[PDB]
């Protein structure tokens, strides 16, 4: 799952000049990527 206040950041919005928003966007990206890696490995695990 992806939670709100994060999905709103991940949505392909416009660049806001502040750096806080960019840092938070990178944080959300990394979180979703780790979750996706886990879920993709999950199939090769559970097939056995």
């Amino acid at each position: 799952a992806i939670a709100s206040e994060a999905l709103s950041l991940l949505s392909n919005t416009y660049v806001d000049g502040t750096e806080i928003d960019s840092s938070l966007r990178i944080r959300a990206i990394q979180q979703m990527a780790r979750n996706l890696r886990t879920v993709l490995d999950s199939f090769e695990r559970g097939t056995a």
Partner: protein, 48 residues
């Protein structure tokens, strides 16, 4: 112990800080007695 149950919950995106906007200090005014107009009334003289 604070495990995230499903995945990527809220409260991981806060960035809510507080900032010290600046300080302020003052300096005194070192007055000398002889500079004043009241010194005329007396004749100061040391006597160790």
């Amino acid at each position: 112990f604070f495990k995230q149950i499903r995945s990527d919950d809220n409260s991981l995106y806060s960035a809510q800080f507080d900032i010290l906007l600046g300080t302020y200090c003052n300096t005194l005014n070192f007055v000398r007695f002889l500079e004043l107009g009241l010194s005329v009334a007396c004749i100061c003289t040391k006597f160790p």
